[PDB]
Structure formats: C-alpha cells, structure tokens
Symmetry: C3
Amino acid sequence: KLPGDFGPPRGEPIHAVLTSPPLVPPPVNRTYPAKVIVELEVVEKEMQISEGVSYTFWTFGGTVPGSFIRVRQGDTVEFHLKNHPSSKMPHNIDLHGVTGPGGGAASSFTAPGHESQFTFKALNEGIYVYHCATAPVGMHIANGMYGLILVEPPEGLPKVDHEYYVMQGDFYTAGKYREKGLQPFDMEKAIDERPSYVLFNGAEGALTGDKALHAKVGETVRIFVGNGGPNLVSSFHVIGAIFDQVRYEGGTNVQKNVQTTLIPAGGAAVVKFTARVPGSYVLVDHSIFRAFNKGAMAILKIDGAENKLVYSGKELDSVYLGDRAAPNMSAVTKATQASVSGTLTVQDQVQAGRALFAGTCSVCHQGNGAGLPGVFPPLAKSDFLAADPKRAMNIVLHGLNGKIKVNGQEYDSVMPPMTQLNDDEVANILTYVLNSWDNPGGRVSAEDVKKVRAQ
Amino acid sequence: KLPGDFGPPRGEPIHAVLTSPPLVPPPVNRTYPAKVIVELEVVEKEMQISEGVSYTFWTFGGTVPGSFIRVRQGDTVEFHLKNHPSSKMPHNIDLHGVTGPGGGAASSFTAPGHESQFTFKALNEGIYVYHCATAPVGMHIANGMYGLILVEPPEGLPKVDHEYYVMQGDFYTAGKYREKGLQPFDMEKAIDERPSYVLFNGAEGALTGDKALHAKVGETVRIFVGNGGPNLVSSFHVIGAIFDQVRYEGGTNVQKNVQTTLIPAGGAAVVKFTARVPGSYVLVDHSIFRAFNKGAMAILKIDGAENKLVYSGKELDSVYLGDRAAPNMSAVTKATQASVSGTLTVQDQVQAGRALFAGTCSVCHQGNGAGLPGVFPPLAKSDFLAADPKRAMNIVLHGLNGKIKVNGQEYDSVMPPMTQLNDDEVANILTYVLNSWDNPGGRVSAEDVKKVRAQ
Amino acid sequence: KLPGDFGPPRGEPIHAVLTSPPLVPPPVNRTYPAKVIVELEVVEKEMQISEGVSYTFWTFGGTVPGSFIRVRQGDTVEFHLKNHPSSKMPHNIDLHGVTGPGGGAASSFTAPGHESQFTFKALNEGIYVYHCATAPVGMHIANGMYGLILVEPPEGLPKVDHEYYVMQGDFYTAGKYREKGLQPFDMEKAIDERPSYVLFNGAEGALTGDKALHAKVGETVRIFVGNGGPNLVSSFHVIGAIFDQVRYEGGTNVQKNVQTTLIPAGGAAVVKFTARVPGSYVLVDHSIFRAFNKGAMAILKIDGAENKLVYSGKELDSVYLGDRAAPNMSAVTKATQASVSGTLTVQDQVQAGRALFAGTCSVCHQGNGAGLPGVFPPLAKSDFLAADPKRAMNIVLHGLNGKIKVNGQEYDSVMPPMTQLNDDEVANILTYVLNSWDNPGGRVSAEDVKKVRAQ
Ligand code: HEC
Ligand code: HEC
Ligand code: HEC
Ligand SMILES: [Cu+2]
Ligand SMILES: [Cu+2]
Ligand SMILES: [Cu+2]
Ligand SMILES: [Cu+2]
Ligand SMILES: [Cu+2]
Ligand SMILES: [Cu+2]
C-alpha cells in the first residue's frame, strides 16, 4: 500500500494552471485525488541575460525558470510535453518526485514540432526540481531548462499572504561577465564549474529594483526556492532577516529560525518569511563573489511603518547593493544598442555611465563626485582629471596609488584596480564623469579603453 | 561512563569479515561486545579508470573504495594494517569513528613489506569514512585510499532485502577525460579542485549496465554511501525515486522522504530505498557535469511487473544515460589495445564507434542514422557525408550550422561542436558511421583527427 | 508580538565586552533585557598570513576573525563602528541576526577617521556571522572583514569548561601558496573561487603547535565556528573525535553525534566536544587539499592520562600533520627576513630547512635521514647525493624514478615530484640535508633552484 494511497482519481480531469516566475498557481484547494492534465511547451529563444547581453535560452514555457506546476499528493498526472517547431534541439523532462525510471525522460522525448505524453502518480509530497534530460544533459540544463513542481500535502500548505517562485542557476558564456553582445554557451567553463553569471530567474536584475518581490509589514511570505544548477550549491541566505522555516523537497525534517541554508544542485526548498520592519531584503548565494560579482541577488521589498525600537537604520543603498540599488539600468541597454547601430551619442554614454557609477565609484568618490577632502579625492571639477583626461582610463583599469594633489589638497592613498570592467563600461563611466559636476566635457570610447588595456 | 559502555569484551576474538565493493559483510548479529581483529592490506596497482584508460591506484584491500569493515558499537577493535612489499609508498590509516589522535594514523604507519597494529574501542555507532593519513595526504586519498567502516548500533540495523556499498571520489589525471593510456596523478588539478573524473567505486561504469546493483519490486535496499573526496561535496541524488531515510554518520537526526542530499567531503550516509516500479534508478552527483560528463552515475536496476497506474513511461535509455545505457563499452577497450599493438582494424573501430555513438550522436541522428526529415539530417546513406567524408571531422569537432541539403531535403539548424571528444573517439565514431547503413566504407584515424584539430 | 519580546531595556546600559580570537567574552549571566553599547573599530594592517608571507588585512578590531560580540536575545544593541584614520577604504557592517535592511549596512557606512551608529533589537537567538558590506563586498570580506556575534538564549547556554572562537576563511594572493613577501589581493582568483590559502583565524598555524587550543580529559569544550568565506563551504570535521552536538545559527534543529558537517559560506555553528583521551584533535575542512595543502587545520590539544582500553595509539605526528606537528616554524620567518636583508647564512637555511623537512621529506627518508634499506634510500651520508649535490634540485622539483644505487644498496622505486615547493623552500631543505648527518656541507640558494626550475 504505497505512500499517497488516496484512491483512484475522482471527478473530471483538471487542466493544470501553470504560472510564470516569480508567481505561483493558486492552491489546489481540494480534498480528493484528481487526474491532472499538464501541458508544457519547450521554446528556444534569445533573451537578455544582462543589459546589452543576449543569450539563447532553452525554456520550459518561455521562461527561466520554467512554468511552475502545482498538483496534490495522490494525483494522477498526465504530462504532455510539446517541442515548438522553431526548436533546433530535441528535449524531454525528468521531474523530481516522479516514481519511475528517468523521472519521465524516455517517454517524454520530443523532437521539434512534436508532442509526447506519459502518466505518473504523484506519490511524494514536496517541492521538486524538474529539468530537461536530453544528452548533453548539462548543456540543456545550463541553457535554462529547469523549473519547479509542487506536490501539495493532502491538507494543503498553511495559508500565507504571498507565494513566490525563485530559482538559482549557474550560466556559462564565452565572454566575460557583462561583455556585451550575443554570448554563446561555453562548454569548457561549464565542465570546469566556472560560471560567468550566477542568477535568480534567468537574468541579472530579474528580481531587483523595479522587479522586486513585494509584501507589507506583518505579512507572511512563502518562497519556493529552486537550484537548477547545473553545478553550483547555493549558500542561500536572506540579508537582514531570518527564515521562520526551511523545508527541503518533501522531507519530514523542518528547520526553523535560520538565515543561511545550503541548497544542493538540483535541490529545492520552501522557505517562510515574516515581514517585521520595512525595507529591502536580499536573497543571495552567500558564496559572496556570486552574489556581488556574478548577479546572484534578488529583492523582497517590504513596505510599512518603521519601528525604531527594532531597527533604527536606513534602507539598503548602493554602498551594499551597488548598481542594483536603482530601479533599473535601462540606460546601459540603450547605450549598447546605440553602439551596435553606430548611433552612440555622448548623452547615451553619460546615462549609461550614471547607472554604472552607483556603488562601483560612488562608494568612495560619492554620488555627487565630491569625495571627502584629504581621504577620497573629488571627481567634481577635478583639476587632476582635467589636466590629463585620458589618464583616467589607466586609473580605472590599473588603479592609482602614491602622493597626488587634487584641488589643492594632498592625497596619499590607494584606489584599487578595476580591470574586470569591460571597455564599454570604463568608456561610459568616464564619459559620465567628464560631463558632470562642471567638468570639461568630451568623451572616452570603448576603443580608447581597448587600446589602453592592450598596453 | 563514556558512550558505548557495554562492558569488557566477552567470548573469543572474532576475525572481521571484510568485503569488496559493492557488497557488505553480514550483520554482526550479536548482543555482546567482542574483541574484533581486522586485517587490511594496502596494494598499489594499475586498474582501468575508464575504457582504455589506466591509472595507478593505491588501495585498501585491492579495491576502490577499500574493503568494507563491519563491527558493533562497544567492540574493541585490534586493527592490523599490512603494506604489500610491492608498494613504493608508506601508508597508514585514519578511521572516522575512532576516539584518539589521528584516528589511528601515527601507530598505523607502515612501510612497504611491514605490518602495524593499534587497538581502539568503537564508542560511536554510525557509518564512517576511513582513509590514508600519510603525507601528502591529498595525493594518497586522490589515488583511491578510502573506504567505509560501519559501527552498528547494539540492536543492529533493521533488516532489509539488500545492502550495498557505493562510494564517490574525485580523480585528477594529467590527461583529459577519456584520453587513453596510463594517466599520471595531476597535483595541479587536485590543488585546484578540478577533477577530470568523478566516479562511484573507482571507475567509469563501475555500477552501470551489466555491473548495476539489483533488487525487485517490493524490496528494501539499504546503501552505505561514502564520499571519499578528496575535495568534492556530492549533491547526491536518485533519479526517478526518493530515499525513505537518509542518516549521516552516527547522527541522531534522520531525514525521511528526500531525493537530493549533500554529502560532505569525507562524509558518509546510510540511505534506504523501497522499490516501487521496475526500471533503472540512477545514483548521481547532481552537480550535473559530474554526473554526465565525468562519470558520476551508478545504477540500481529493479526487476518486476510494471504498474501503469503509478508510472506509464518507458525504461531509461541512451537519450538520458548516453553511452552507459548499454551493458558495457568493451569494444572501446579492444580498439584502444589494438591501437597500442598497431593491430587496429576497421571493424575494431566500427565496434568502438558503435558504443560511443549511443546518446552522443543518436539523440539527434537516431540509432539507425535516419534522423528526422527536415529537422535532423540522416547519416544513413548521407550524400552530404559521402561527398566529402573528411569534412565530418570538422563537423564533429567544430559543429555545423547554416543551410545545407542532405538527401534532397533542406536543413537550416545547428549541430553544436563536440570538441571534448578525443581524437580516437572522433575517428572511431566516424569509422562506424562510414561503415553502417550502406555508407561508402573507409575509415578515419586518430591521427587524421589530430591534424584537423590542429588547424 | 515579535520573537524576543522580553520587554523594554531595564537597568543601566552595558558596555559590551569584546574579545579577540580564539577567546570569547564571559556569558552575560542575566535575566533581563538590556541596552548594550558595542564599540568596534576597523583597522587595516599588514600581518603574517604564513611564515615570511605578509598580507594587508582589513580587520574588525585588529584581528581576523574580528572581535567576538556577545549579547542576549531581547537586548537593544547600540552599535558604534569607528574607522581608524589610517584606513584607506570606507567600511561598514552587516550583522547576521539583525532584523533590518542590510543588517546595519547603510547606517554604519564609515569613512576613514569617522564613526557611525545604528540601533537594533536582537530578536533572534543564535551564533551569527558579521562582515563588512562595502562595495566591492567580496574584496572586503576576502581581506578579513568578518567575525561572530552570539545572541544568547534568555536562559544562557549550558555551562562548559572552555569556550573557543574559530573561523574559516578563503584567501586570494597573487603569489602561490608559501611564496614569500608582501602578497597583494588577487581579484581574478577570488572571482574564480580559487583560493591560495584556506585558514582558521587568519594565518597558517594560527591554531597549531604552540598556538593550539587546550583542554583536559573529562572536560567539555564549546567552539563557536564561523565560515567567513567569502566563497568556500567547509566540510568541517574533527579528526579522531566526534561532536556531541552541532547547532547552526539559531536553528531549532540540533544534530548530535556527528564528525563531519557542512558549514555554508557566511554560516556559523556551535559545536560541543567532550574530551575522552589525550592527544591532538584536528579541526579541518575535509575538502582535503584545503586542510593539507592550503593551511586549513587547527588543533585542540587534550592533556591527561592515556586510556589504552579506548585507544592504544600514539599522538599525532608529522606523518599526518606534516610541518605543523612542531611547536612552530619561526626559523622560516628568520630565514626569509635574512634573505630580504641580504644577510642569509648557511645556518639560517639549515634551521629553515629543518622545519620544512618534517613530513614533507621525513615520511619516507625519516627524521634522521636513514631511510629504510632497499625501500627508501638514505639522505644521511648519501654517496648518491654527495656525487652530484646539484642534481638534488631536479630530484625535489621533478621527482626521481628508476634503478639507482645508494650506499651499496639497489633501489627501484618512485619519488614523486614536489614542484609546488617554492625556490627558497627547496634551497633551504637541501641546505639542511647537505649540512646534516655528516654530509659534505655547502648550500643551495633560492636562485640556484630558480635556474633549474627554468630549464
Ligand atoms: C575607493 C575604494 C575608490 C573607488 C571604489 C574608486 N576610487 Fe577613484 N580614487 C580613490 C582614491 C583613494 C584615489 C587617490 C589615489 C592616491 O594615489 O592617493 C582615487 C583617484 C581617482 C582619480 C584621480 C584623482 C581625481 O581626479 O580625483 C580618478 C579620476 C578616479 N579616482 C576615478 C574613479 C572612478 C571613475 C571610479 C569608478 C569606476 C573610482 N575612481 C573608484 C578611491 C576610489
Ligand atoms: C543534435 C544536437 C545533434 C547531435 C547530438 C549530433 N548532431 Fe550531427 N547534425 C545535427 C544537425 C541539426 C545537423 C545539420 C546542421 C545544419 O547546418 O543544419 C547535423 C549535421 C551532421 C552531419 C552533416 C549532414 C549529414 O551528413 O547528415 C554529419 C556527418 C553529422 N551531423 C554527424 C554527427 C555525428 C557523428 C554526431 C555524434 C558524434 C553528431 N552529428 C551529433 C544535429 C546533431
Ligand atoms: C616518499 C614518497 C618520498 C618522499 C616524500 C621524498 N622522497 Fe626522496 N626518494 C624517495 C625514493 C623512493 C627515492 C629513490 C627513487 C628511485 O629512483 O628509486 C628517493 C630519492 C631521493 C634522493 C636521491 C637518493 C638519495 O640520496 O638517497 C634524494 C637526494 C632525495 N630523495 C631527497 C628528498 C628530499 C629533500 C625530499 C623532501 C623534500 C624527498 N626526497 C621526499 C622517496 C621519497
Ligand atoms: Cu532540452
Ligand atoms: Cu535531476
Ligand atoms: Cu597511503
Ligand atoms: Cu578524514
Ligand atoms: Cu570593509
Ligand atoms: Cu552576510
């Protein structure tokens, strides 16, 4: 008498409601086992992985992660996979939580333009990763082919104010982080488990600024958190808060009151958060260079009244979140498109630089370029800058140390090199600086920086 | 009054029954503390890490992982380590679960041709890794020097139908994955934690195809799962099933109903599985490139009657498991030996290619080379191939995209590059294709591919 | 009615007692919520990361990890951060366990020579990592900016005989492991998560030999264990013992009786150990190349009476712990300083080599250089060595195999290459060998080895 033994399906078959991230379908709200028909379509498509950076994703339902599936333990699921005729590759599916070889893989093999089906009973309650299972499996997963299926316990999950859907992935581009253009998959980097981006929901900034998740003080938030991998294990953490509960897959064990929790590659967890004070709460992989150098940050923004007895501090700003504190970086997308078309203006560069200056430069030189006299020199009306604007390229790329004088004040400090900035980025930041705070104007081009880097 | 306080040893000393993977000794089936004499011998020996790839392993008892040791909490263990006189290195042992400095290491130091002993009381119930503890410790572990010791609780573990022994390891060869010949240990790759192979039980295919583990529908299977490392943490997972229970070392905590669980480097767990429906269940490290590009897959094959109410799908096939869906790849071993002896025939190559074509090429071009008209072009009687057979080398190594015509049908798709295939592999796959499905015949050599790669 | 609801602060404000690793402040020993004033100062400073290897650390309170903070759940904490005027960078703080955006980060932003404050209520009991939150966050963390804050439950933790403070970190130097001199931060290695050192408490040997932690047989030891990262997840393990209990952050779950446990990047745990038999117990990251090739080993030394019924073996020695079995390696620091000043004598080299020979060479050739006739050849009065002393450089760097004769005995074995040793190390070890056991004398210089490596 297997687990999930709740009887044959009753009533009429139900068409599963699938939702796109970061949203989840309604709770099933039923007390009997059903036949649930799931229809999921694979689409291969270019999308923006970062501003001005395109990638050819392979997707379940048009999104990364793929559509969220929600059924009840004991349901019989008739699973239809369609492969869009525009696809170049064959695809299939392995759903964790399926009891059967391959989790569906052999019977769901689907060539472009075709459809397949298989039927399984959902014996196991829990939150589960599903992903493509087509050789080379790692390429298909790295291209975005993963999502979550929730198999509810028979009584349903406890009611909460909000449910969200967040899934980490590691991505492997031929180009470096934030190198612009259409970036191919990089098999070498993937085999070595050296990702160029580590992301929530398939893109840089997918869940930051104006795309943050929302709740209010006093409300409960449940997040279904997946780790599609392919390779990385997430040190999954919420900055400035705690999880009331963390439950992995369909495990009997529930951990309560933790802030940092390890999600295996291919793993999934349900976490619960209670909003206590207003502000922005950051979901990160706390393997910190992923969070702050490769894109692995998401925001849950809580609105409501401050409570100074609990926290007197200010909201998250660019000192910590860097260039993602702002609503968006659309100016970088505009500038990159303008360079492609050969139509790049000084103002395109100024606006792109403005977005990129936040955190990256403002932490020391300030948002207004004033610096701090004798500690951090000014960029606003800087004589040192105006004397030799082109030297700024070497300063950004290779740093500056030693005694210098700026606006009649001596400095003897260290600006670290910032060699990871791409040529266009250095060009744009510097064009912004040159055209702000009554500086001389002019501009630096991507090709100017390339030549200096090449020295 | 220390834990495991069950009295002085009683009766006569017992000689421990040690077993080679994937098998385990009988349950001790006793109710009193004994003196248990363990005799374990270190042997350094070349073995096949993959087809036609040899490696000089250092082993406890002739195998990787080493012999399984099984005692009862409260036993006094008199541990004898012998180092075979053919050994070049000194060796010793640290058993997790030992209470004492080094877990035995200082007193078990054993030069080639010598023997050592130390005595310890097994105070701690649990499943524990043991490994060599001889500087450079990481080299000794990376060479295969690890195994499991089970310290039973006093009542014994619950009875199950089968017990098996599976242990993950990361391996570091100078050559790339599947590069043939005797491969040295690569210290650089090891320090960087960049393994070339990630394996269960010391070899590719050690537990796949005809070497799978077995059980029947309705039966319980306990697996003692170790992670010898040296470096990697396993996202340990069973495809298409769930673990009833996962228990780490001798921990009081037992997790129930999970599919994916993180095993630390040097860690060990006891997992329980109940067979529900027939087919092949894959144990993997779900850091996916390990599982599908570096060897980290093992099979538990369940025989019995299908249950279409639980799973209507087909058994695991080469679309998912690739070239390990088949019983074995002995043809690759034969072809590699033939190249060594200068006796390599066309048929040796054809049979080696046949083994390697499964998954790697058949996912798109099909097992019969028919492809799918207008979506994947045919390899069977392909005019495009016959027009310029040597171009096939560039197609496999560097991919093909753009408009082409094959057997009177237009294609406009993408075949990704497969540059990770070694020269012999490309040669053999192509010789198989050229000599199948009424294609022109002939052959490609490893040296032909080398020259094209070198372009 | 939030967690930690124990009332407004009562009594007078308390000035927090902060302690430097590996020590912890006294238990708060109180039954009422207080206002606790914390004053923590950031200092940037060069320290020795290894013998003769300097690094510019950025520190909370002058140490890595930073000062330990100890408060009670329900306390109101008024947190003052001062940035020393000698600092070149701005700094701030995110304390895990804070309920509020950034964990303090925006309001604690502090330029060199300035001070900031924010107030928070400690609602969440547990052990928590705190770290700098200043862009580039990963650089600041990698430079040493992390520590632990304990928020006690209201009843206090159970009494133990000793409390200690241990925190892992991964470090990224431009130079290789044990390459001497002032080593810059290496951003490339950090982004790739390829550390050169992995350390407890900010240095090689910080907690080994004469800097070990101590307890006696029968005593309980609690260790507050942090993982500052920035990037690595620790397979945290105690060699030759077991943890009675492991509790992560403020989690409700407590695991009992485990030896190996995974600590997320940014995570923290409280572990408990009961001393049973005397000797040295090694805390390691069991991703083994970290422990034995990158510095990740710490010692808890237990004094008291042997108990041969539990463990008959000898204390940890250089076969396992290598060059850290000894009290210290101060001779290496002396020799490195002498080379800097151009004052390096033969004896400076001999004493430095002596320290480095332990484990690295003695495992095979023995502490007395006698070797083992016919198995490992002698270094003591070695004719083979004396015939061509300079050949020894190639033997250490590239290994030796094949038939050789030494002191009238034939050998046919393998000495692996040791290419990871730095030029000064090879020079010093060889100068030690040449000047010991009635060998001919003379010396090898760092520049001699460089030239041979360069071949
Ligand atoms: C703190 C860590 C800094 C960050 C981040 C950035 N800069 Fe910087 N900068 C900093 C210091 C301490 C100095 C003086 C170095 C010395 O030798 O004492 C500088 C210097 C400059 C200059 C030249 C001086 C001037 O015109 O004020 C320029 C043009 C400059 N810095 C620009 C710049 C930009 C564009 C940055 C972001 C990309 C940036 N700096 C980051 C400290 C810090
Ligand atoms: C799908 C992902 C494929 C896999 C895996 C392999 N091949 Fe392929 N191949 C595929 C496509 C879509 C195409 C057409 C590309 C285009 O420009 O439209 C091809 C082409 C070939 C050819 C040439 C055409 C022909 O003779 O049919 C050859 C000889 C070929 N492919 C061989 C080949 C081999 C040996 C493979 C395994 C090693 C292999 N292909 C993998 C799709 C896919
Ligand atoms: C065991 C793993 C060894 C370690 C660690 C080191 N040495 Fe070694 N050494 C070893 C062997 C088996 C041999 C003989 C190799 C053969 O071809 O049979 C050697 C040889 C030498 C020699 C030359 C012979 C002699 O003078 O005895 C020298 C000078 C030597 N080894 C030095 C040396 C040093 C300095 C080491 C530490 C840095 C060292 N060896 C490590 C085995 C092993
Ligand atoms: Cu796919
Ligand atoms: Cu999976
Ligand atoms: Cu060994
Ligand atoms: Cu160990
Ligand atoms: Cu800082
Ligand atoms: Cu943090």
